[PDB]
Structure 1
Amino acid sequence: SLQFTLLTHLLLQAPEGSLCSLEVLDDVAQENNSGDIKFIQSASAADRAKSLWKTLSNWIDLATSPDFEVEKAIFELYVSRPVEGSIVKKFNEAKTPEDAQEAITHARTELWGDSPHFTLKDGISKEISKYVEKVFTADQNLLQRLICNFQLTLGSGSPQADLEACVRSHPVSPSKVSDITNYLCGKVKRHIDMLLEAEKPAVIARDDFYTWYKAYVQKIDRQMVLSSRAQAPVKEKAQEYLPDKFVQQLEIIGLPYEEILGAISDYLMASFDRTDWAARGEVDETSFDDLDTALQRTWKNKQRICGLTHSEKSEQDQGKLLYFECMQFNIPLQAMSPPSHFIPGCYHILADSLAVGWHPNYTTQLKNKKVA
């Protein structure tokens, strides 16, 4: 579960409008404009390895398809250790076609053999011998291009901490950074699974992952905006903020998100209105109790009517009908003249106590979401 961290970190640092591939020729890829995909690999680097040459000489031809990397293709290598042989050292330093060709000549000498006989092909085991033969049999210009601009990556030494650092670098709530990266990596892993369960080359497009990141960031932000705002959330429920009881009732009814925002605004505004009236002395500890008892009685009557009438609709639909009927309902109380939002806010405050409900089984459904 380390390649996930590496790919996540580098995609966060990948340029916009990018495309990347996974476990095709390297564990990480990136696409720019033409053939010879640019690649980055993770090593547990080693000059010789059957998997390395295997993947290289296998899907370089697929990497040769256009719209995938500049022919002077960039290349990188993240290694969890400073170990790097002389041949790989020379590869990374190969930033010029001539230097890349010289490095490939050295690779032929050490793995394939000395020109023209090339006898070291037999000196290495058949397994890697045939793969190095395939590597070196291709046009040497393509060998130049595939190692034209090789690089190596060495982070802080702790891939996790670096991942959380780069995530937190973007504008995001620091209280949720951990979860963010977690979810991100998980998605990648799950994605990879479905790409290999169906036996297809797994591809993680930088833009697809970037859109995932945007969607999840917006998801957590909308979760946060529907915070408690009425009581201190419990630390167990603080990891992912749990909206108050009335917001939960609305969600159980399945109202649109914007309607929930309006409900929350009405709740806050009604709370402030009652506070201000008390602070002015207009109302008192008993000027509202008549209001609340009347609200509850009218809600019960409306609930009975809705249950008798809208039974054909589903439970959520009946709840929406009762909700909208109650909020639209307006009875002129004592000569206090309240703004439009006051009565919806009062219903919401009552709903926060489960004394007034929308869903015909709002108690049972609230228990369900509690155990959900």
Structure 2
Amino acid sequence: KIDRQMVLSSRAQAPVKEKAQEYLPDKFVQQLEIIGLPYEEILGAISDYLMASFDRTDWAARGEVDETSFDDLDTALQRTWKNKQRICGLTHSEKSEQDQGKLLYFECMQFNIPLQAMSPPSHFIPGCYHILADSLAVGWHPNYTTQLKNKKVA
């Protein structure tokens, strides 16, 4: 009551259940499973995609976030992706490529960063993470592109 916000309080609702199966053929998905990632949190990340995209459109339409904020946020997030990618590639090389991919995914999802000095919701970071995964901007598997090409034929 009688509070004040001046922060990215994204207005969104529970995503439609069918869209979870609808977005299954999406590129970020077949980036995901190829590291042995289970289907339940696959659906969770799919939902996170849905609300994250809806909130991105909401901010772009109504207007609370400058355009350069998304760009430099994603640039920093991609740099962090690559840094942790190499970190897990070296310090965890003494085991399977599958587990390397899943540990990279886990250790990357914990990252947080403010936007315009203000805190986004907890679901936003995985959403932009998988958005980068959509356009080959980030990858969880150490050789993700090769396995993506292999699975696109099978």
**Global fold match (TM > 0.5):** yes
Q: TM-score w.r.t. structure 2 length?
A: 0.82
Partner SS state of residue 223, structure 1? coil
Partner SS state of residue 68, structure 2? coil
Equivalent-residue separation in structure 2 for 1:224 and 1:370 (angstroms): 45
Instruction: Note the alpha carbon deviations across 1:138-196, whole angstroms, 9 max, x for none.
Output: xxxxxxxxxxxxxxxxxxxxxxxxxxxxxxxxxxxxxxxxxxxxxxxxxxxxxxxxxxx
2:12 aligned residue? 230
2:53 aligned residue? 271
Q: How many residue pairs end up in the alignment?
A: 154
Once the 2 structures are TM-superposed, how far is the Cα of residue 335 of structure 1 from its aligned partner? 2.0
Instruction: Note the alpha carbon deviations across 1:8-65, whole angstroms, 9 max, x for none.
Output: xxxxxxxxxxxxxxxxxxxxxxxxxxxxxxxxxxxxxxxxxxxxxxxxxxxxxxxxxx
- After superposition, residues 1-372 of structure 1 pair within 5 angstroms as 243-372=25-154
Q: Percent identity?
A: 100
Are residues 312 and 225 of structure 1, via their aligned partners in 2, closer, same or farther at CA, if it must alter by over 3 Å? Answer: farther
Larger Cα-atom Rg: 1
Equivalent-residue separation in structure 2 for 1:307 and 1:350 (angstroms): 19
Name the stretch that deviates more: 237-246 or 248-257.
Answer: 237-246
Are residues 267 and 224 of structure 1, via their aligned partners in 2, closer, same or farther at CA, if it must alter by over 3 Å? Answer: farther
Q: TM-score w.r.t. structure 1 length?
A: 0.35
Once the 2 structures are TM-superposed, how far is the Cα of residue 264 of structure 1 from its aligned partner? 0.3
Instruction: Note the alpha carbon deviations across 1:257-298, whole angstroms, 9 max, x for none.
Output: 101011101111111111111222111332210111001100
RMSD: 9.6
Are residues 269 and 364 of structure 1, via their aligned partners in 2, closer, same or farther at CA, if it must alter by over 3 Å? Answer: same
Partner SS state of residue 22, structure 2? coil
Equivalent-residue separation in structure 2 for 1:261 and 1:291 (angstroms): 25
Instruction: Note the alpha carbon deviations across 1:101-155, whole angstroms, 9 max, x for none.
Output: xxxxxxxxxxxxxxxxxxxxxxxxxxxxxxxxxxxxxxxxxxxxxxxxxxxxxxx
Instruction: Note the alpha carbon deviations across 1:309-339, whole angstroms, 9 max, x for none.
Output: 1101211100000001111111234323211
Once the 2 structures are TM-superposed, how far is the Cα of residue 224 of structure 1 from its aligned partner? 39
Instruction: Note the alpha carbon deviations across 1:215-234, whole angstroms, 9 max, x for none.
Output: xxxx9999999999999999
Higher strand share: 1
Equivalent-residue separation in structure 1 for 2:97 and 2:30 (angstroms): 15
Are residues 357 and 222 of structure 1, via their aligned partners in 2, closer, same or farther at CA, if it must alter by over 3 Å? Answer: farther
Equivalent-residue separation in structure 1 for 2:136 and 2:3 (angstroms): 26
Equivalent-residue separation in structure 1 for 2:40 and 2:56 (angstroms): 24
Are residues 236 and 277 of structure 1, via their aligned partners in 2, closer, same or farther at CA, if it must alter by over 3 Å? Answer: closer
Instruction: Note the alpha carbon deviations across 1:236-255, whole angstroms, 9 max, x for none.
Output: 99999961111111111111
Query: Contact (CA 8 Å) 1:228, 1:244: kept in 2 or not?
Result: no
Are residues 318 and 274 of structure 1, via their aligned partners in 2, closer, same or farther at CA, if it must alter by over 3 Å? Answer: same
Equivalent-residue separation in structure 2 for 1:221 and 1:241 (angstroms): 38
Moved over 3 A (4+): 219-242
Once the 2 structures are TM-superposed, how far is the Cα of residue 304 of structure 1 from its aligned partner? 0.8
Instruction: Note the alpha carbon deviations across 1:59-115, whole angstroms, 9 max, x for none.
Output: xxxxxxxxxxxxxxxxxxxxxxxxxxxxxxxxxxxxxxxxxxxxxxxxxxxxxxxxx
Instruction: Note the alpha carbon deviations across 1:197-224, whole angstroms, 9 max, x for none.
Output: xxxxxxxxxxxxxxxxxxxxxx999999
Are residues 352 and 227 of structure 1, via their aligned partners in 2, closer, same or farther at CA, if it must alter by over 3 Å? Answer: farther
Query: Contact (CA 8 Å) 1:227, 1:242: kept in 2 or not?
Result: no
Structure with the bigger RCO (C-alpha within 8 Å, sep 6+) is 2
Once the 2 structures are TM-superposed, how far is the Cα of residue 342 of structure 1 from its aligned partner? 0.1
Query: Contact (CA 8 Å) 1:266, 1:345: kept in 2 or not?
Result: yes
Equivalent-residue separation in structure 1 for 2:22 and 2:7 (angstroms): 12
Query: Contact (CA 8 Å) 2:49, 2:126: kept in 1 or not?
Result: yes
Are residues 279 and 368 of structure 1, via their aligned partners in 2, closer, same or farther at CA, if it must alter by over 3 Å? Answer: same
